Amino acid sequence: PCYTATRSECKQKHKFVPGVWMAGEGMDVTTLRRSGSFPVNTQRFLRPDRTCTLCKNSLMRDATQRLPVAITHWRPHSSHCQRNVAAAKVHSTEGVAREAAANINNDWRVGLDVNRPEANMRASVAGSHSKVANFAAEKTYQDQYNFNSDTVECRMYSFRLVQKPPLHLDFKKALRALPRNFNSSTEHAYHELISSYGTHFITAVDLGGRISVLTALRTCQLTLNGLTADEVGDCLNVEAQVSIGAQASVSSEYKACEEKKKQHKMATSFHQTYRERHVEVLGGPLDSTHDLLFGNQATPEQFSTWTASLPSNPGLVDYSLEPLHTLLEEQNPKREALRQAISHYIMSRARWQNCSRPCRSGQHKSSHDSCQCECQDSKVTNQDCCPRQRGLAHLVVSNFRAEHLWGDYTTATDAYLKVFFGGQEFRTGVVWNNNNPRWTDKMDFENVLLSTGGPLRVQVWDADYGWDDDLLGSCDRSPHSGFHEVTCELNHGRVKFSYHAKCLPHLTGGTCLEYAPQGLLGDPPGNRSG
Numbered sequence: 001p002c003y004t005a006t007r008s009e010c011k012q013k014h015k016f017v018p019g020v021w022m023a024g025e026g027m028d029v030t031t032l033r034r035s036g037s038f039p040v041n042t043q044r045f046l047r048p049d050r051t052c053t054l055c056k057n058s059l060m061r062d063a064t065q066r067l068p069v070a071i072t073h074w075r076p077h078s079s080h081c082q083r084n085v086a087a088a089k090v091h092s093t094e095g096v097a098r099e100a101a102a103n104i105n106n107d108w109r110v111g112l113d114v115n116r117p118e119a120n121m122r123a124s125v126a127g128s129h130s131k132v133a134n135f136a137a138e139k140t141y142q143d144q145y146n147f148n149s150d151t152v153e154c155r156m157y158s159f160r161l162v163q164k165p166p167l168h169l170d171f172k173k174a175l176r177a178l179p180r181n182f183n184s185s186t187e188h189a190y191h192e193l194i195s196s197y198g199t200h201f202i203t204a205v206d207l208g209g210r211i212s213v214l215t216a217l218r219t220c221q222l223t224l225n226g227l228t229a230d231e232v233g234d235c236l237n238v239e240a241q242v243s244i245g246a247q248a249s250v251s252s253e254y255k256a257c258e259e260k261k262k263q264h265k266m267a268t269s270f271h272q273t274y275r276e277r278h279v280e281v282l283g284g285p286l287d288s289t290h291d292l293l294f295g296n297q298a299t300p301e302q303f304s305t306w307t308a309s310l311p312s313n314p315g316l317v318d319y320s321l322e323p324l325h326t327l328l329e330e331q332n333p334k335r336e337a338l339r340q341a342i343s344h345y346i347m348s349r350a351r352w353q354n355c356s357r358p359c360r361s362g363q364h365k366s367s368h369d370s371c372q373c374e375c376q377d378s379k380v381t382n383q384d385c386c387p388r389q390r391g392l393a394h395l396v397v398s399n400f401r402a403e404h405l406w407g408d409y410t411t412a413t414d415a416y417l418k419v420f421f422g423g424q425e426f427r428t429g430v431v432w433n434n435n436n437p438r439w440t441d442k443m444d445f446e447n448v449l450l451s452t453g454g455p456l457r458v459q460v461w462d463a464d465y466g467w468d469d470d471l472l473g474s475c476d477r478s479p480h481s482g483f484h485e486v487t488c489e490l491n492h493g494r495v496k497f498s499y500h501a502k503c504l505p506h507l508t509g510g511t512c513l514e515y516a517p518q519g520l521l522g523d524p525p526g527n528r529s530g
């Protein structure tokens with residue numbers, strides 16, 4: 001809808017097409033954040049012969065708007081934005097970076113060395129240091145998380161740069177103040193140009209609006225409450241669709257969510273219950289930029305208002321990135337130096353999987369692969385090493401010894417012990433003719449319910465050859481988490497023993513009922529490495 005205007009039409013006061021100055025801006029591919037600096041100058045509006053290009057904007061009541069000479073393919077889209085919440089299930093930080101980087105339409109890698117064999121294990125390069133990836137990494141370090149993404153997109157405009165755009169004088173000067181090649185000493189001079197003008201520059205754009213909400217769900221806390229990561233995730237998507245008006249309070253999907261809300265005795269909605277969210281809002285006024293899917297003021301009316309603001313205040317939805325060196329001429333030797341510099345900057349900032357690092361607290365590396373983490377109790381715990389129910393613990397009863405022990409008939413004691421817990425029974429060997437017997441038994445009760453139990457029963461028996469053995473005494477104890485020393489007083493003497501009841505990973509408290517986060521062993525991630 002753009003046309004070549006006459007010298008008179010060009011003299012007229014007209015605003016530029018919305019968000020046009022976004023094209024040509026530099027961007028750091030590792031963070032997916034605009035550099036603030038412009039290696040390309042798109043400011044020129046009037047052609048050498050004093051004529052220009054003007055566009056009729058159908059999204060702004062056919063307003064006559066100015067188009068810079070460096071901009072081509074200006075195309076406005078529909079004002080109608082389909083109320084559709086795009087849901088995604090992400091399982092790692094690598095996936096979050098991938099979902100963030102999915103907004104780059106082209107191959108940003110072209111002409112760059114973005115391939116080390118040891119530093120390429122499940123490596124995130126684009127969006128590795130993006131705000132959303134850093135959010136997913138911080139969560140990953142704290143506890144075992146599963147991520148749910150809910151997205152709404154409206155495309156308002158699309159435009160691109162010219163094949164040979166005019167370079168900025170500030171950029172041309174910065175290129176001169178650079179050394180001839182990328183040795184190991186010039187590393188700082190080049191990294192200053194990269195940190196200022198970005199690794200790439202935006203060559204094409206799709207402007208409009210985007211609401212992107214990443215919800216972090218503690219995978220093991222969910223399993224204890226009888227919910228799955230996919231169950232809660234699907235419920236959030238439905239709640240987001242209600243807030244934007246995609247579906248009303250009367251639908252098959254929303255009925256299932258209201259059923260699960262009552263079934264699991266929830267006071268408020270899934271979004272009011274699971275508040276560990278990262279929110280990205282692009283487009284609309286900065287004065288009214290907030291969560292429209294899971295916000296407290298999030299109404300279908302509030303979504304329409306935002307949608308209406310998009311034509312005049314558009315944000316960067318998706319784009320095409322080209323490396324900085326592509327701006328320099330092929331004859332110039334500083335191009336190959338910058339190409340190598342960008343390659344080095346991007347690569348040093350990569351985030352990969354170091355199989356040398358220890359597994360998440362409560363896991364261990366298998367003998368088969370150094371990159372494979374195994375659960376401690378495969379029987380009771382499901383996948384992702386989450387305990388199936390509250391109260392599960394590893395009970396080991398040992399250090400069995402009795403002092404000055406005898407019964408109602410004789411001082412000649414032929415003692416042995418019967419130990420009971422959770423339907424399981426263990427028996428020691430007989431210590432013939434001894435008032436102070438000591439047993440070497442280490443009773444592994446494996447995985448038991450510390451809450452249900454019932455009691456940890458220790459029966460002291462006296463072995464009688466032909467006749468029925470006589471019970472010297474019996475005692476009960478309600479086991480608690482940790483190492484405990486027990487002393488049971490009998491009619492003659494006492495029986496002593498100890499037990500360590502270790503809560504399964506993700507469980508804490510006296511009877512292993514409470515939920516506990518399982519963090520990664522080491523220091524928190526905040527810098528470039530694997």
Ligand SMILES: *[C@@H]1O[C@H](CO)[C@@H](O)[C@H](O)[C@H]1NC(C)=O
Pocket residue numbers: 181183184185186
């Ligand atoms: C710096 O670059 C120059 C290019 O002429 C090279 O001669 C020199 O060895 C480099 N310095 C290093 C690699 O420390």
Ligand SMILES: [Ca+2]
Pocket residue numbers: 412413414415462463464
């Ligand atoms: Ca006996």
Ligand SMILES: [Ca+2]
Pocket residue numbers: 463464465466467468469
């Ligand atoms: Ca007997």
Ligand SMILES: [Cl-]
Pocket residue numbers: 485486487488
């Ligand atoms: Cl005791």
Ligand SMILES: [Cl-]
Pocket residue numbers: 396397398399498499500
């Ligand atoms: Cl013990």
